[PDB]
Design an enzyme around this catalytic site. Structure first.
Site, mmCIF file in Angstrom:
data_model
loop_
_atom_site.group_PDB
_atom_site.id
_atom_site.type_symbol
_atom_site.label_atom_id
_atom_site.label_comp_id
_atom_site.label_asym_id
_atom_site.label_seq_id
_atom_site.Cartn_x
_atom_site.Cartn_y
_atom_site.Cartn_z
ATOM 1 N N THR A 19 7.017 -18.032 -22.181
ATOM 2 C CA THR A 19 5.765 -17.136 -22.433
ATOM 3 C C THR A 19 4.866 -17.440 -23.552
ATOM 4 O O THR A 19 5.043 -17.698 -24.265
ATOM 5 C CB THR A 19 6.888 -15.952 -23.632
ATOM 6 O OG1 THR A 19 7.973 -15.919 -23.442
ATOM 7 C CG2 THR A 19 6.144 -15.352 -24.232
ATOM 8 N N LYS A 35 3.858 -11.274 -14.383
ATOM 9 C CA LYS A 35 3.453 -11.737 -16.382
ATOM 10 C C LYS A 35 3.978 -10.095 -16.623
ATOM 11 O O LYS A 35 2.513 -9.078 -16.331
ATOM 12 C CB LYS A 35 2.382 -11.977 -16.022
ATOM 13 C CG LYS A 35 2.040 -12.283 -17.517
ATOM 14 C CD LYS A 35 0.366 -12.925 -17.418
ATOM 15 C CE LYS A 35 -0.186 -12.456 -19.449
ATOM 16 N NZ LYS A 35 0.261 -14.193 -19.644
ATOM 17 N N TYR A 76 3.733 -17.766 -6.219
ATOM 18 C CA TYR A 76 4.329 -18.533 -7.221
ATOM 19 C C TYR A 76 4.001 -19.791 -6.810
ATOM 20 O O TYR A 76 4.157 -20.312 -5.540
ATOM 21 C CB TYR A 76 6.295 -18.501 -6.806
ATOM 22 C CG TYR A 76 7.224 -19.067 -7.168
ATOM 23 C CD1 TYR A 76 6.614 -18.935 -8.720
ATOM 24 C CD2 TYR A 76 7.786 -20.094 -7.173
ATOM 25 C CE1 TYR A 76 8.024 -19.304 -9.909
ATOM 26 C CE2 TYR A 76 9.082 -20.146 -7.867
ATOM 27 C CZ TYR A 76 8.842 -19.917 -9.329
ATOM 28 O OH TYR A 76 9.579 -20.240 -9.730
ATOM 29 N N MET A 77 4.041 -20.994 -7.799
ATOM 30 C CA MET A 77 3.819 -22.355 -7.530
ATOM 31 C C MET A 77 5.680 -22.884 -8.270
ATOM 32 O O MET A 77 5.367 -22.998 -9.709
ATOM 33 C CB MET A 77 2.922 -22.123 -8.927
ATOM 34 C CG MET A 77 1.608 -21.623 -8.392
ATOM 35 S SD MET A 77 0.702 -22.176 -6.977
ATOM 36 C CE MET A 77 0.040 -24.020 -7.487
ATOM 37 N N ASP A 121 -11.456 -23.711 -20.434
ATOM 38 C CA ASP A 121 -10.709 -24.329 -20.755
ATOM 39 C C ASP A 121 -9.679 -25.020 -19.427
ATOM 40 O O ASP A 121 -8.187 -24.550 -19.902
ATOM 41 C CB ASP A 121 -9.477 -22.349 -21.391
ATOM 42 C CG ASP A 121 -8.337 -23.940 -22.248
ATOM 43 O OD1 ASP A 121 -9.032 -24.347 -22.811
ATOM 44 O OD2 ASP A 121 -7.894 -22.733 -22.498
HETATM 45 C C1 LIG Z 1 9.008 -21.775 -12.302
HETATM 46 O O1 LIG Z 1 7.870 -22.857 -13.288
HETATM 47 C C2 LIG Z 1 6.620 -22.105 -13.446
HETATM 48 C C3 LIG Z 1 5.758 -21.238 -12.602
HETATM 49 C C4 LIG Z 1 4.887 -21.019 -12.792
HETATM 50 C C5 LIG Z 1 4.931 -20.400 -14.127
HETATM 51 C C6 LIG Z 1 5.434 -20.787 -15.548
HETATM 52 C C7 LIG Z 1 6.142 -21.742 -15.141
HETATM 53 N N1 LIG Z 1 7.424 -22.022 -16.043
HETATM 54 S S1 LIG Z 1 6.738 -23.416 -17.519
HETATM 55 C C8 LIG Z 1 6.708 -21.353 -18.226
HETATM 56 O O2 LIG Z 1 5.317 -24.027 -17.190
HETATM 57 O O3 LIG Z 1 7.914 -24.002 -17.645
HETATM 58 C C9 LIG Z 1 3.402 -19.930 -14.713
HETATM 59 C C10 LIG Z 1 3.191 -19.081 -13.181
HETATM 60 C C11 LIG Z 1 2.013 -18.227 -12.230
HETATM 61 N N2 LIG Z 1 1.050 -17.594 -11.883
HETATM 62 C C12 LIG Z 1 1.620 -16.638 -13.853
HETATM 63 C C13 LIG Z 1 0.364 -15.636 -13.630
HETATM 64 C C14 LIG Z 1 0.333 -14.612 -12.918
HETATM 65 C C15 LIG Z 1 1.533 -14.249 -12.872
HETATM 66 C C16 LIG Z 1 -0.475 -13.497 -13.972
HETATM 67 C C17 LIG Z 1 -1.870 -14.042 -14.097
HETATM 68 C C18 LIG Z 1 -1.656 -14.781 -13.657
HETATM 69 C C19 LIG Z 1 -1.068 -16.420 -14.131
HETATM 70 C C20 LIG Z 1 -1.758 -17.579 -14.605
HETATM 71 N N3 LIG Z 1 2.775 -18.380 -11.107
HETATM 72 N N4 LIG Z 1 3.512 -19.354 -11.172
HETATM 73 C C21 LIG Z 1 4.042 -19.475 -11.833
#
Ligand SMILES: COc1cc2c(cc1NS(C)(=O)=O)=CC1=C(NCc3c(C)cccc3C)N=NC=21
Length: 243
Positions: A19, A35, A76-77, A121
């Site tokens: 979150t 998101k 996805y990362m 940032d």
């Molecule tokens: C599995 O681990 C994770 C993977 C991701 C992640 C968080 C975690 N876990 S944590 C909270 O770090 O512990 C956030 C993202 C993301 N994009 C996010 C994004 C979206 C969907 C829309 C607009 C802007 C952005 C930046 N792609 N992969 C991951």
């Protein structure tokens, strides 16, 4: 929007990440982050302009949006945020892996520089790591004092050279394995010490060549600091020399 609009029927929610952001599948085959949106319609539409018009291998890639309800769907990362990836001691990084994390971010930043886009940032917490360990910067859209040059802290003078400063601190974060910059100082003490010309120490894992590169990002005079293109060349040179 257009081709950027994703049909939400094609999204499958599999797990909650943090979150709110959730891991999922897009059209069956594609792994995605989703998101859940907090923010106004004017603030969203401006954040959409950035994501749809910027694209690079080391920037987190937008796949689409659901704006008829609202979701933002991206690449996805698998390894999550960079700061936590660094802190997990099971990885036991070789120094070549750490230099390659710096190169990835630098490639992203050199792209953003070429498009005259200011990140504002840059830090390890705002970088994400995929399944192959490739680090990517989140362009997407508590003042970050510890990542700021003196001209930002005193005068709010943001420029390409304040991102350069921040990148230097990001390298330090990587070579310290995710320690807080100036971890024994408050934000106020950090701003004072950097005004007096104090800089971050060389992390043990950082060689003299690597340290020189990160230190060049912290020159008091902003115009003495390199571009991201220059930094990329310096990183590439060190990679060829030290490996
Ligand atoms: C599995 O681990 C994770 C993977 C991701 C992640 C968080 C975690 N876990 S944590 C909270 O770090 O512990 C956030 C993202 C993301 N994009 C996010 C994004 C979206 C969907 C829309 C607009 C802007 C952005 C930046 N792609 N992969 C991951």
């Amino acid at each position: 929007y257009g081709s950027w609009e994703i049909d939400p029927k094609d999204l499958t929610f599999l797990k909650e990440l943090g979150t709110v952001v959730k891991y999922g599948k897009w059209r069956g085959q594609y792994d995605v982050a989703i998101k859940m949106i907090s923010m106004s319609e004017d603030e969203f539409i401006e954040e959409a302009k950035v994501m749809m018009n910027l694209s690079h291998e080391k920037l987190v890639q937008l796949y689409g949006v659901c704006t008829k309800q609202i979701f933002i769907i991206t690449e996805y990362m698998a390894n999550g945020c960079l700061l936590n990836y660094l802190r997990e001691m099971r990885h036991r990084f070789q120094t070549q892996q750490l230099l390659e994390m710096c190169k990835d971010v630098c490639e992203a930043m050199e792209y953003l520089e070429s498009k005259q886009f200011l990140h504002r940032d840059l830090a390890a917490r705002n970088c994400l790591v995929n399944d192959q360990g490739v680090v990517k910067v989140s362009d997407f859209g508590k003042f970050p004092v510890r990542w700021s040059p003196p001209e930002v802290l005193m005068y709010s003078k943001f420029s390409s050279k304040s991102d350069i400063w921040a990148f230097g601190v990001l390298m330090w974060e990587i070579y310290s394995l995710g320690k807080m910059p100036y971890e024994r100082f408050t934000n106020s003490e950090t701003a004072e010490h950097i005004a007096q010309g104090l800089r971050l120490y060389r992390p043990h894992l950082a060689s003299e060549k690597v340290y020189t590169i990160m230190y060049s990002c912290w020159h008091e005079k902003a115009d003495e600091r390199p571009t991201f293109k220059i930094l990329l060349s310096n990183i590439l040179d060190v990679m060829d020399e030290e490996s």
